Write an enzyme that holds these catalytic residues in place. Structure first.
Site, PDB file in Angstrom:
ATOM      1  N   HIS A  19      -7.098 -40.096  31.486  1.00 17.16           N
ATOM      2  CA  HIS A  19      -6.561 -39.706  30.188  1.00 17.16           C
ATOM      3  C   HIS A  19      -7.747 -39.394  29.305  1.00 17.16           C
ATOM      4  CE1 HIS A  19      -4.337 -39.304  26.609  1.00 17.16           C
ATOM      5  NE2 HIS A  19      -4.700 -40.479  26.102  1.00 17.16           N
ATOM      6  N   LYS A  34       0.003 -34.833  38.392  1.00 15.29           N
ATOM      7  CA  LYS A  34      -0.577 -33.594  38.047  1.00 15.29           C
ATOM      8  C   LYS A  34      -1.432 -33.093  39.200  1.00 15.29           C
ATOM      9  CE  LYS A  34      -2.407 -35.403  34.537  1.00 15.29           C
ATOM     10  NZ  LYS A  34      -1.951 -36.748  35.076  1.00 15.29           N
ATOM     11  N   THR A  35      -1.993 -33.996  39.967  1.00 19.86           N
ATOM     12  CA  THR A  35      -2.919 -33.579  41.019  1.00 19.86           C
ATOM     13  C   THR A  35      -2.228 -33.092  42.304  1.00 19.86           C
ATOM     14  OG1 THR A  35      -4.665 -34.952  40.114  1.00 19.86           O
ATOM     15  CG2 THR A  35      -4.799 -34.429  42.510  1.00 19.86           C
ATOM     16  N   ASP A  51      -0.256 -40.687  36.724  1.00 16.46           N
ATOM     17  CA  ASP A  51       0.521 -40.959  37.895  1.00 16.46           C
ATOM     18  C   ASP A  51       1.780 -40.104  38.075  1.00 16.46           C
ATOM     19  OD1 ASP A  51      -0.789 -43.280  39.479  1.00 16.46           O
ATOM     20  OD2 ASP A  51       1.369 -43.146  40.059  1.00 16.46           O
TER      21      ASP A  51
END
Ligand code: GDP
Ligand code: GDP
Ligand code: GDP
Ligand code: MG
Ligand code: MG
Ligand code: MG
Lengths: 397, 397, 397
Positions: free
Chosen positions: C77, C16-17, C13
């Site tokens: 993860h 990274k995206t 959260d």
């Protein structure tokens, strides 16, 4: 370990000789085999008889990781002219030496031109005597003189390597410390740049055997039940039966046939290879359709012609040549490969009479066609005697 | 764990194949690696193209404590003739199988002879089918029939091992009980004697690299400032620079030089070793003094000759050979290693005309000398085509 | 324009995206080629099958002046643990993203450690969400949490780049103004810092062909008159004949040979290059001296071993792995490159039984040696099935 032919060209006294000795001593270090030679030895070239001419020529061999170089060096500008043209020793590349003190000079410019006429594939420069000059504006100046010259004769002056150094100094270090190796000394290291330059820029040449097939007819014979036979040593490539080839020259038109038979030392043979003196069975060829002086070659590989331009050298009287000069209209015999073929000469503007000892460039126009190509070397004869030697430089038709 | 080449020979039906399948199974037990094969597989040999000839040949590998044996077995008497002669697979020793019920037989006698001509260093006998004969007077009879034959062809018949057993029976036990080991079963144990006999009697061979240096000239070249170069794959031993060697064959006399340079894959090389395809630098040798077809070898190792005796096999027409026979005076081309060398044949008393498919023995006499030795294998050619294959058996001069 | 492999790691959260999509659009502006992607697309990674395992993985490519980066980003993860380990995609550098609001977090710390086990060469941080925090005391606090962590796993935390920003905001400007370029906007400009950071901090990688020669033996054969042949795909660098190589692993000792022959697609070949599936002719090598599982490599480039440390991941049962855990003493098969090699495991202190699905770190000790290096990836199998995947992290001998 491929073998390449090189040599030092350049003006007198620029140091082609000293640079030569250095090359031996330096490369020896990493190549123990390599026989080291000094100045005096090289400085005293032997005579060599080539095409009827004598050329003081000196040879030396050295090895890099990449190759085996046999290297020429002659004592006089004349030796260069004659060598290059009779092609005593054929350069695959040449190392052009120029005095950093003087810049290029007349012979400098001449060797470039020849090297280009005679076909040298690559020139690499070694600017020598750099120890006499600090001012980099000067070193640049010379380098540039040199490149523009190369560019003038079509070398890629913009690209060649111009390595700056002192052959004299490098040579003494090799003297002081035969075992000196790379990185150890500065002067020696410029030699390593040269040597590298060479391995890199001078193309590794085509092995004869891999060049397109060609064999020049020497004799023609008929084997009663077998047929017509063209004999002679193969100049390049190879032939195996069933192979189709062209009979080029002399005749009014080119003919095609098939080797239906090789042969040597009496016994038969499966393939004819460069170097080989065979006799081939030509299929469907009259004893007329083929004659001495023509060439057989891989189809489409060479063309017949009559008008060409050539760079030539005319023997002196003392060397057995003409004893008076000539004008345009001179019509000796041109001896191509195996035979004479008459031709008339036309001197270029500015040339009015050529003299014994000269070396010039003119055009010729032959009575019959001949399988000609640029680089094709030849002789100029007057009653069997050689009066000159030339190299074909351009086809005009 | 040294590697040895063996195989079964002997008359048809005597059981060389069944004996073959037993050796795998039996020795597998104490050597788990060992890949076990049966009758049917071995029974169906594949073809093998050797020297232009096709030979049904079967292979099998087994291991003892002492070694690794690769073992041949062919289906037909022709197959043996051919195999042994072209030396498809070379026997280091052979295992001769003979039916206890029949004694030695014609092929039995033949194989002995060939093995001797072809050079088999040792024969060891396995007398099989013993289960068909109780009478020890008989078993002795055969054994002795066998020994005298061997003695007749110079094997030490008096000394070899004549093991008596049943390959069929051992094989089934190995079948019933793969895990059977020594001492456990009688039939199996005879196989163990065989295997032991083998390990013991069949001498362990010289590794090529350990045999005296020899390299047959393939090409000759000159490296300008370097000199003469003899190239080719090394047959045996090794060469390092400074090594002195003889140039043998063809020439009227033997010459000695020093390799002054090995070389391979362009790069240099410190030692030339058996198996290696090099190019050597011969010191002080004209491009004439050395030619294809000669051999370079450890000094005094091999001698030149022109007269010799040989055991030969002549191709059938169906196999591409001659299509009519020949007499004494036949003069084909004997291709030794790299080149053809003409020779005239002389048939022995009793033989008057040889025919396609025959295998015989005669003498030859070459036009020029050649480096010959007993065991030297060769080909008989007619216009590049192989019309027979032989082995040199004796030198007459 | 060198190609480099990167990707985003860090806690869930942290973004990274979103930062991933921004890099595309931002760098696009100065690199029109560059294909812009958004959140949702990257957010929905596809599966990838790697070593039998499935990993949702998303890819993206962007360009700076200096390079071409192909960039990964995974959703969970787990995806990270799997990916990094089986090395589906190998990071040349990674961009670690951390929430400015929360500071580093558990996965945050996890990723650092793995990145270190797995060998990531450089981490560069992007502190995101900075728009939620004014207080610089805070922003400094987080940055420092982050550097200490990296320092804890040996990264030079003290030096790396910690760039503070808002991916979400840069991304909307690029949205609003696709043409926005440097200097124009503040949020976008932070992305430019990241991009520069990358180009600067993450070392430029070695092209496989340039890495030291290594090829892993798949099969071994003999070419009757030529000898031994090792076949398989070259993993790196290249081979040309005459090249000397070492045969590493499995054997009790390392052997040296020379390729005397490359070969592919039946035809010959001058050089064997990374990617290529050749067959090499090893010179002087018994059919025993070489076997599947060993590697041939540039001499001295890799060493054999038996004890090593590793980071591993153990398949769940639902993914086809073990269905019960294991203890120290576990002795599966470690499939290095081409073959299984048995090994016994030793769990570290604190670990007492490993369970399906776990990912951990332990040591192994192999029955025979193997050409091992840190970074060497491998599989853990039970009867051909893969039960786990790991990476070699340290050599102990
Ligand atoms: N200052 C200086 N003198 C040199 C160097 N190279 C050669 N010399 C000398 O220049 C003269 C010409 O040398 P040489 O090699 O014989 O040239 P060539 O006429 O082109 O054969 C000789 O006296 C050498 O001793 C160098 O690098 N620097
Ligand atoms: N009784 C008996 N027969 C055998 C034994 N060995 C082989 N045979 C049989 O001999 C026949 C020929 O065997 P084989 O190995 O094929 O002979 P080869 O043609 O010389 O190979 C077969 O039918 C085998 O069963 C043995 O030890 N005793
Ligand atoms: N306030 C703020 N929120 C952000 C920022 N970047 C990302 N977000 C939000 O972070 C949430 C999770 O981010 P995401 O990019 O999916 O991260 P990932 O979990 O590492 O895949 C989403 O709702 C984003 O829109 C930013 O710079 N500031
Ligand atoms: Mg000179
Ligand atoms: Mg049989
Ligand atoms: Mg994500």
């Amino acid at each position: 370990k491929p073998h390449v032919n090189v040599g030092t060209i350049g003006h007198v006294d620029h140091g082609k000789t000293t640079l030569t000795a250095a090359l031996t001593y330096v490369a020896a270090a990493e190549n123990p085999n390599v026989e080291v030679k000094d100045y005096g030895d090289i400085d005293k070239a032997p005579e060599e008889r080539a095409r009827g001419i004598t050329i003081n020529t000196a040879h030396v061999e050295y090895e890099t990781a990449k190759r085996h170089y046999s290297h020429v060096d002659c004592p006089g500008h004349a030796d260069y002219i004659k060598n290059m043209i009779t092609g005593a020793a054929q350069m695959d590349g040449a190392i052009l030496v120029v005095s950093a003190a003087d810049g290029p000079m007349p012979q400098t410019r001449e060797h470039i031109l020849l090297a280009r006429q005679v076909g040298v594939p690559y020139i690499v420069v070694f600017m020598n005597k750099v120890d006499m000059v600090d001012d980099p504006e000067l070193l640049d100046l010379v380098e540039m003189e040199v490149r523009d010259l190369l560019n003038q004769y079509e070398f890629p002056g913009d690209e060649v390597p111009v390595i700056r150094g002192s052959a004299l100094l490098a040579l003494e270090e090799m003297h002081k410390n035969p075992k000196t190796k790379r990185g150890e000394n500065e002067w020696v290291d410029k030699i390593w740049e040269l040597l590298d330059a060479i391995d890199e820029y001078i193309p590794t040449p085509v092995r004869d055997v891999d060049k397109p097939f060609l064999m020049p007819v020497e004799d023609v014979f008929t084997i009663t039940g077998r047929g017509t036979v063209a004999t002679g040593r193969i100049e390049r490539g190879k032939v195996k039966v069933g192979d189709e080839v062209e009979i080029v020259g002399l005749a009014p038109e080119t003919r095609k046939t098939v080797v239906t038979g090789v042969e040597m030392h009496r016994k038969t043979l499966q393939e004819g290879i460069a170097g080989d003196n065979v006799g081939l069975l030509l299929r469907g060829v009259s004893r007329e359709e083929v004659e001495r002086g023509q060439v057989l070659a891989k189809p489409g590989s060479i063309t017949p012609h009559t008008k060409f331009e050539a760079s030539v050298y005319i023997l002196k009287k003392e060397e057995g040549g003409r004893h008076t000069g000539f004008f345009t209209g001179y019509r000796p015999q041109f001896y191509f490969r195996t035979t004479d073929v008459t031709g008339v000469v036309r001197l270029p503007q500015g040339v009015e009479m050529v003299m014994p000892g000269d070396n010039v460039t003119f055009t010729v126009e032959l009575i019959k066609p001949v399988a000609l190509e640029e680089g094709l070397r030849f002789a100029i004869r007057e009653g069997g005697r050689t009066v000159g030697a030339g190299v074909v430089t351009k086809i005009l038709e």
